[model samples]
Target: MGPGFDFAQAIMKKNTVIARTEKGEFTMLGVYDRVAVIPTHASVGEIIYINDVETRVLDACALRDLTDTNLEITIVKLDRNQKFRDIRHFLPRCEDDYNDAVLSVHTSKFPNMYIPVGQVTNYGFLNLGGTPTHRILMYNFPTRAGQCGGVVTTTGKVIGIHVGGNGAQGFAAMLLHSYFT
Candidate 1:
C-alpha cells in the first residue's frame, strides 16, 4: 500500500500525471488551457511520499481557504496581479493523447464564493448540461510553466496528481471535499 511497488505503479499509469507532496500523494489530470482538473474518484491507491520539500511556484498571497457553500475546492494560484482569466475553455478530452477539449464546469450561481481580488472578471459559466446551464468553479492563478494535471479520488481512494493550470493561473487549487456535490 506504499510507493515503489511495480504492480501499484501500473494502476497509477491510469492517471495523467503524478504530484508528490510532503504530507501525502496525489494524482492529476491535465485539462485544456493549461488548467488541471482534480476530481474525487476514491478508487485510486495511496500516493507516494516525497523526501525533499518543493518550492512554492505561484505567488499564493491572494489564495485563501474560505467556508463558502459554493466552493468544492480551494483556488490556489501564483499571479496575484494578473486579471482573473477564464480557464474553463480548455478541458482535456477523454482520449489517449490528452488533447485539449472544451469542457466547462458550470453551476447555477457563482461556483466559488470568493475569487482573488483582481480575478473577479475571470468568472464564467459552462453549458455542461446543454439545455440547462450549470456554472462551474472559475479561478485565475498563475501556474508553473509546464505543470498540467491533478488528483482524483474514487471510493475514498487517492488517485492522480495535478500538473496543468499554466495557461492562465499557474498551479493552484486542490479539491479535498465536495462543494459541488
Candidate 2:
C-alpha cells in the first residue's frame, strides 16, 4: 500500500554485517558511494572490523560540514590486504517520506544472528551533543546502545544510517550526496 515498503522488503533480505571496534561491536550497513558509512562515534578504534569475515579499518574521516548535521558519518577505508566482497550499494535517490514504513538491519553478538526492521515516523532535527542536526525518527526498532552505524532502507535503497535513539524513538543520519563531495 505504500510506495516503497515492498521494495525495501526485498532489500532487507540481503545479508547484514557487524563492525568490531575496540569500544565494542556494532552493526554496519554496507559501502555506498565508494565509502563505508558508519556512526561517527562507533567508528573509533585502532583497528575497525567489518563483515562476517572481519575487515580491519585502514582509515576513516568524518563526512560532515563544519557544523555536523544528521549525516554524521565516518567514511571508513578497510585494510587493503583484506578485500570486502559484500559491500551493498545505496539506493540512487537520497529522499523518503514522513510516516513511511522502513527497514533497519542490525547485528547481534553472534554474527548474522539478528537483523531488526523498523519504521520511519518522521524527519526532523535531532540534538546529538547539542548539535541540532537533521535526522530520521524511527519506531519499533529495538536497537542497542552503541549499536549505531546500521543501515536503514526504503524501496530497495539505503536512506539513512543509525546514529542514536531512546526507547520512545530512534534517530538515523540521512544520507546526502553533498556529504561525499
Candidate 3:
C-alpha cells in the first residue's frame, strides 16, 4: 500500500495544461507562482490550452544545454492569471534512494481525470547529455504520447517530473534544488 493521501484528488486540485507544438503535444505541470514546467523537447510555440480556455506563452526557456539531462527542463510563463492545481513545496536537500517508491500523476484519456501511473523501480544518473544527472526509472507504467510533463511524488511530496518513456518503462528528471533558486 502507498501513502494515504488522495493522489487523484491532489492532482485534480492543481492546474495541468496541455502544451502543443508543430511536431506534437505533451503535458505541462504547473509550478511556482506564475510559471509552469514542461519537458524541453516538448516544444512550445505561441499557443497552449488550459481546458477550453486558450492561453499564450509569455516566455519559454530551456534551463540548460539541450544535451544535458538538465536540458530536459523548460519553464513557461503564462500570459494570464489562471488558477493553478498544485504548488508543492520542494526541498533542495531531499535524497531519492534506489527502489524507493514514488507515485506518478498524469492526465488520463479523459481530460477531467488525473490518475497514478506507477511506482519507481530504480534511481540513477543518466549520461544522456554532457554529464550524468539523476533520473527515476519505472516499469508497468502505462504512458501516452503527450504525457511527459506529468508530476511524480513520494509520500505526498513532489520529487520529479516525467520526461520520457519506452513502452511501460520510463524515466523522469529529478527536481533539483537549484530549480527553485
**Winner by lDDT:** 3
Instruction: List model 3 lDDT by residue over 1-181, tens digit each.
Output: 4452354346535646665565455556777666878776666768776544578888887776434445477788888675464354643245454333343344434354344555565566555334455555554566656557766665545666777666656677666666755
The sequence of per-residue lDDT tens digits that candidate 2 reaches over residues 74-160 is 777766353333434443345555444454455564332223454575566667757666645565666567557656665546667
Candidate 2 runs further than 4 Å off: 1-15, 32-34, 51-56, 66-70, 80-89, 92-99, 110-122, 129-131, 135-143, 178-181
Lowest-lDDT window of 10 residues in candidate 1?
95-104
lDDT value for candidate 2? 0.58
* TM-score (all chains, Cα) for each model: 0.24, 0.68, 0.71
As for lDDT, the candidate ahead, 1 or 3, is 3
Model 1 Cα lDDT, one tens digit per residue, 1-181: 3222322233234323333444233333433222233322111222321112232324111112343222122222211222223322222222111111111111122111111212212122332213211123233544332222233222222222222342564222233223212
Put the candidates in TM-score order, highest first.
Answer: 3, 2, 1
Enumerate residue pairs that collide in model 3. 13-85, 14-85, 14-86, 15-84, 15-85
User: Candidates' lDDT values, in order?
Assistant: 0.27, 0.58, 0.60
Candidate 1 vs 2: which has more lDDT: 2
Per-residue lDDT, model 1, residue 130, is 37
